[PDB]
Amino acid sequence: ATYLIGDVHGCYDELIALLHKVEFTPGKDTLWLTGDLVARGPGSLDVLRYVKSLGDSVRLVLGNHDLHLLAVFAGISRNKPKDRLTPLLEAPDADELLNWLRRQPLLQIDEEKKLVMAHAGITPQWDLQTAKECARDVEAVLSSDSYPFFLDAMYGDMPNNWSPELRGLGRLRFITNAFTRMRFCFPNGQLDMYSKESPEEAPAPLKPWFAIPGPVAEEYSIAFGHWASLEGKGTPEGIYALDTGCCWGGTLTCLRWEDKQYFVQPSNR
Ligand SMILES: [Mn+2]
Ligand SMILES: [Mn+2]
């Protein structure tokens, strides 16, 4: 069976309880995770140890908090106490875990399931070939020996409009924002990097990225996490918003792909 789970945010106990609920069995089953494995919840260290141990039985995409963790580890960014990352950063296997994490994809595609996953979704300005190329480019910088330079370059809110002519720092910044920070778009598809509200609460003319027809969404189902204020609700057919805010006192959500059956684990917080 195929299981897709939204943002874990250090909620190790809830993750394991939910996997036990569905009797997740590596070798029979595959788990997809929307990223943001770490921060806020108490168990980021245990989450990374477990997910790394799954090997080919897990298909991960990196989220914005995973990248922030890498930036803290590399000395690029300051540690925020509320993220509760110190046990992971101080662990004797921190290097092993974080060098594995920075090698993981930004984008997962299964052609037989016609299923795409990224942390924030797929901007309507991208077709599939462009999304693949951009994921490859950023994965290449993250898996290189020079990844601290890219992590430093990644921060920024511009440019917010895709063009194949984009080059350099702006190109990498846009790619990172589209895969890991996107929520709202302007009517022309341009990213808004400020509004984090639910769609009903957003200022006009902002609309969810998935409310603008894009070429990937027309051919593929898209699973994503990230957007907790969406509460996993309000999406069109073929769009699966799996982040139901476990670390916020919400729930951890698991979707089984074969029958589109949902399983939910309440937050312990
Ligand atoms: Mn998140
Ligand atoms: Mn996120």
Nearest CA to 179 among 90, 106, 255, 247?
106
**Residue 117 CA to ligand 1 centre (angstroms):** 14
- Whole-number Å distance between alpha carbons of 176 and 170: 10
**Residue 35 CA to ligand 2 centre (angstroms):** 7
- Whole-number Å distance between alpha carbons of 26 and 225: 22
Cβ atoms of residues 11 and 41 within 8 Å: yes
DSSP code at position 80? P
Could you tell me the two tokens for 248?
A: 């916020």
Strands 58-60 and 30-33: parallel
Residue 132's CATH number: 3.60.21.10
**Which positions ≥6 away from 183 have C-beta within 8 Å?**
120, 192, 195, 196, 208, 209, 226, 227, 230
**Residue 12 CA to ligand 1 centre (angstroms):** 14
**Residue 5 CA to ligand 2 centre (angstroms):** 13
**Residue 165 CA to ligand 1 centre (angstroms):** 31
Ligand nearest to the CA of 246: 1
What phi, psi does 111 have (nearest 5°)?
-70, -30
Per the structure, how many domains does the chain have? 1
Could you tell me the two tokens for 74?
A: 């590399």
Cβ atoms of residues 185 and 209 within 8 Å: yes
DSSP code at position 107? E
Burial of 218 (0-12, 13-18, 19+ CB in 10 A): exposed
**Residue 122 CA to ligand 2 centre (angstroms):** 14
**Residue 9 CA to ligand 2 centre (angstroms):** 9
Ligand nearest to the CA of 243: 1
**Residue 235 CA to ligand 1 centre (angstroms):** 18
Provide the domain limits for residue 236. 2-266
Residue ranges of the alpha helices (H) in 143-221? 147-154, 168-180, 215-219
Residue ranges of the alpha helices (H) in 7-43? 12-21
Q: Which amino acid is at 259?
A: D
**Could you tell me the CA-to-CA distances from 63 to 46, 101, 118, 182, 197 in Å, in that order?**
18, 11, 8, 11, 18
**Residue 243 CA to ligand 2 centre (angstroms):** 9
Could you tell me the two tokens for 23?
A: 């009797």
Nearest CA to 262 among 79, 63, 6, 27?
6
Nearest CA to 152 among 140, 141, 163, 162?
141
**Could you tell me the CA-to-CA distances from 266 to 2, 6, 161 in Å, in that order?**
21, 13, 38
Could you tell me the two tokens for 16?
A: 């394991």
- Whole-number Å distance between alpha carbons of 115 and 139: 20
**Residue 180 CA to ligand 2 centre (angstroms):** 6
**Residue 140 CA to ligand 1 centre (angstroms):** 23
**Residue 144 CA to ligand 1 centre (angstroms):** 25
Burial of 53 (0-12, 13-18, 19+ CB in 10 A): exposed
